[PDB]
């Protein structure tokens, strides 16, 4: 149900996005970003160190992550 | 430390 | 009809009905209208969420006497080129903005009156954290996801904030066991809400012991992702006579059965234990502890300025009058 | 139950004490100094009549955004009257009347360019061309 994109990087960060199904997507906060405890609570499963660092407003069901290289 | 924290395989 | 005779207070009364861009428009009418458009009484509450702006501008707006400044997810990715005198700001949210360490330092070095602050998601430094210690009246402080500072800077900050009620000090990714130990040994005894999640191996059972010993008034305690905490630490929570909200998600070495003990805490209302209840058993836990709400709060409210009800533009309950909507 | 008020030009109005209470000025004038009418040297008969009319309509109101339908027609007056109403609202210290009158003037300001403002209200424009561009520069950010 939850889609996990492939990772790409720049000289500084690695990047991924996560696409949520409609039922999980409706829980995503609008007024803050999610700490790792919070997105793991939601059911998002990935490695350690990924930071939900911005809200992509046009598509709330898509979560943008980055982690230092 | 049970349950592995990693991305699910494709 | 001459409106030039109309007193200052009455023009301020008319101006106060104008939305932000409308207010800036009318400053270009005369030297008097320009004076009054920047008054004070008009600039108490300001919301610039998501705004891309030069930090000199934000410094200027703050110098006009802003008391509550909502500016999360903003862009201030240019260097400061102006100097400022102390700000009156008491409530400020800059979380998840794009802003350099030096710019952040420039702004915060002029702040001593903060009651509520969120710097969630921002890279800091020792000078920043040290300058934050000027705000000794801080009641709510959010440094979740912040980094770039030593345990020595943290200690000074925590020792200064001796009336702190809510502290979110979670997921500070560059923390070592020194930071964690400083945190539990230096948080104000007054603290009723602590989020210290995300330290895994760097948070030990003895740290919980220190905390409980020092901070008997805890109502919310979030220790999610603390692998070292098992059922042998549970008696520590019974020393907290006011504990209502506990979180122990992904404390993987907790045997699901042992969570029954936490049902004996007389004041407990809610429990988060995500990731440690085997699939197909959660409703057993729930029905076994029916006086508790279990796994119903994915998110922390600790030192968070703005939560829930899908719109919410309030900053710790304050609606901002000047906004770009 | 009933109380008398004298306008600046001498006319005397009989009003309910609770309706007259909506004016904080009149409220603070009733504790000290006795014997009716209450002099109001700063509001004339024409405006006081309107003020009393307003206060009667809002006598049962409990009490930002949205001028009620009745107040919209009530304030459909020339700039002179409205100008006097604000001053009267301020002098008599009637919160709700001050609220709707200020909003009305602000609603006139909404949309009109800074050049229309100095005209429709007849205001003197001092320091032009250099300062006017410097004000625009300071507000560019928005």
Describe the structure.
The complex is a heterotetramer of chains A (69), B (10), C (325) and D (142). Chain A has 69 residues and is of the alpha+beta class. Chain A has one domain: Cyclin-Dependent Kinase Subunit Type 2 (2-Layer Sandwich). Chain A is 16% helix and 33% strand. In chain A, a hairpin with a 6-residue loop joins strand 4 and strand 5 (62-68). The longest helix of chain A has 7 residues, at 36-42. Chain A is globular and about 35 Å long. Chain B is low in regular secondary structure and 10 residues long. Helices cover 0% and strands 0% of the residues of chain B. The longest helix of chain C has 10 residues, at 151-160. In chain C, helix 5 (101-108) packs parallel to helix 6 (126-132), helix 6 packs parallel to helix 7 and helix 8 (177-186) runs parallel beside helix 9 (205-214). Chain C is of the alpha/beta class and 325 residues long. Chain D is 52% helix and 8% strand. In chain D, helix 3 packs across helix 5 (79-92) and helix 5 runs antiparallel to helix 6 (95-109). The longest helix of chain D is centred in the last third of the chain and has 15 residues, at 95-109. The N and C termini of chain D lie far apart (54 Å). Chain C binds chain D through residues 1-4, 6-7, 9-10, 13-18, 20-22, 24-31, 33-34, 53-54, 57, 324, and chain D through 79-80, 83, 86-87, 90, 98, 102-103, 105-107, 109-110, 113-114, 117-118, 121-127, 132, 135-136, 139, 141-142.
Q: Secondary-structure blueprint of this entry?
A:
The complex is a heterotetramer of chains A (69), B (10), C (325) and D (142).
Chain A: E1 3-4, E2 8-9, E3 13-19, H1 22-25, H2 36-42, E4 51-55, E5 62-68
Antiparallel strand pairs in A: 1-3, 2-3, 3-5, 4-5
Chain C: H1 8-15, H2 20-25, H3 31-37, E1 45-47, H4 55-63, E2 68-70, E3 75-76, E4 91-93, E5 98-99, H5 101-108, E6 116-118, H6 126-132, E7 140-142, H7 151-160, E8 166-168, H8 177-186, E9 193-195, H9 205-214, E10 220-222, E11 245-247, E12 270-272, H10 282-288, E13 293-294, E14 322-323
Parallel strand pairs in C: 1-2, 1-14, 2-4, 3-5, 4-6, 6-7, 7-8, 8-9, 9-10, 10-11, 11-12, 12-13
Chain D: E1 2-6, E2 12-16, H1 17-21, H2 24-29, E3 38-39, H3 45-57, H4 69-74, H5 79-92, H6 95-109, H7 114-120, H8 131-138
Parallel strand pairs in D: 1-3
Antiparallel strand pairs in D: 1-2
Helix pairs in contact in D: 3-5, 5-6
- Summing up helix and strand content along with how strands pair, one would put the structural category of chain D as mainly alpha
How many β-strand runs of chain D? Answer: 3
What is the radius of gyration of chain B? 8 Å
| Major beta-sheet overview of chain D | 3 strands, mixed
Q: Total helix count of chain B?
A: 0
- Report the biggest beta sheet of chain B as strand number plus sense, adding barrel if it closes: none
Enter the CATH topology name of chain D.
Potassium Channel Kv1.1, Chain A
Helix content of chain B: under 10%
Q: Write down the oligomeric state.
A: heterotetramer
| Largest interface summary | C-D, 31 and 31 residues
Beta-strand portion of chain B reads under 5%
The class by helix and strand makeup of chain B works out as: little secondary structure
Please tally the β strands of chain B and state the result: 0
Largest sheet strand order of chain D: 2-1-3
The helix/strand order of chain D is EEHHEHHHHHH
Question: How far is the first residue's CA from the last residue's CA of chain D?
Answer: 54 Å
The CATH C-level class name of chain D: Alpha Beta
PDB class: ligase/ligase inhibitor
Keywords: SCF-substrate complex, protein turnover complex, LIGASE-LIGASE INHIBITOR complex
Assembly: tetrameric
Entry title: Crystal structure of Skp1-Skp2-Cks1 in complex with a p27 peptide
């Amino acid at each position: 149900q939850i889609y996990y994109s492939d990772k790409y990087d720049d000289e500084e960060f690695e990047y991924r996005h996560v696409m949520l199904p409609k039922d999980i997507a409706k829980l995503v906060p609008k007024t803050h970003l999610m700490s790792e405890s919070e997105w793991r609570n939601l059911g998002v499963q990935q490695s350690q160190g990924w930071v939900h660092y911005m809200i992509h407003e046009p598509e709330p069901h898509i979560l943008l992550f980055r982690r230092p290289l | 430390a049970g349950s592995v924290e990693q991305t699910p395989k494709k | 009809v001459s409106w030039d005779s109309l007193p200052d207070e009455l023009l301020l009364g008319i101006f106060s009905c104008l939305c932000l861009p409308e207010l800036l428009k009318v400053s270009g009418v005369c030297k008097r209208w320009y004076r009054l458009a920047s008054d004070e009484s008009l600039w108490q509450t300001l919301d610039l969420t998501g705004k891309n702006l030069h930090p000199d501008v934000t410094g200027r707006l703050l110098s006009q006497g802003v008391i509550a400044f909502r500016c999360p997810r903003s862009f201030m990715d240019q260097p400061l080129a102006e100097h400022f005198s102390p700000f009156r700001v008491q409530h400020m949210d800059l979380s998840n903005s794009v802003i350099e360490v030096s710019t952040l330092h420039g702004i915060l070095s002029q702040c001593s009156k903060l009651q509520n602050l969120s710097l969630e998601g921002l890279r800091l430094s020792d000078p920043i954290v040290n300058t934050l210690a000027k705000n000794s009246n801080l009641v709510r402080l959010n440094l979740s996801g912040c980094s770039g500072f030593s345990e020595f800077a943290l200690q000074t900050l925590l020792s200064s904030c001796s009336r702190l009620d809510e502290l979110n000090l979670s997921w500070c990714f560059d923390f070592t066991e020194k930071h964690v130990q400083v945190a539990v040994a230096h948080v104000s005894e007054t603290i009723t809400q602590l989020n210290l999640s995300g330290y895994r191996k760097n948070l030990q059972k003895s740290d919980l012991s220190t905390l409980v010993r020092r901070c008997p008034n805890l109502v919310h305690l979030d220790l999610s992702d603390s692998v070292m905490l098992k059922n042998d630490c549970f008696q520590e929570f019974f020393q907290l006579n006011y504990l209502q909200h506990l979180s122990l998600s992904r404390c993987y070495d907790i045997i699901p059965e042992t969570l029954l003990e936490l049902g004996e805490i007389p004041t407990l209302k809610t429990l988060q234990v995500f990731g440690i209840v085997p699939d197909g058993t959660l409703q057993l836990l729930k029905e076994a502890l029916p006086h508790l709400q279990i796994n119903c709060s994915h998110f922390t409210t600790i030192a968070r300025p703005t939560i829930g009800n899908k719109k919410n533009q309030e900053i710790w309950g304050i609606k901002c009058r000047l906004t770009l909507q | 139950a009933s109380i008398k008020l004298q306008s600046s030009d001498g006319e005397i109005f009989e009003v309910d004490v609770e309706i007259a209470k909506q004016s904080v000025t009149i409220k603070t004038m009733l504790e000290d100094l006795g014997m009716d009418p209450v002099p109001l040297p700063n509001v004339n008969a024409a405006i006081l009549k309107k003020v009393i009319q307003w206060c009667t309509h809002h006598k049962d109101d409990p009490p930002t955004d949205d001028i009620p339908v009745w107040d919209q027609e009530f304030l459909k007056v020339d700039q002179g009257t409205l100008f006097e109403l604000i001053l009267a609202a301020n002098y008599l210290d009637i919160k709700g009347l001050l609220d709707v009158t200020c909003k009305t003037v602000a609603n006139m300001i909404k949309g009109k360019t800074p050049e229309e403002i100095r005209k429709t209200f007849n205001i003197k424009n001092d320091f032009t061309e250099e300062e006017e561009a410097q004000v625009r520069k300071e507000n560019q950010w928005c």
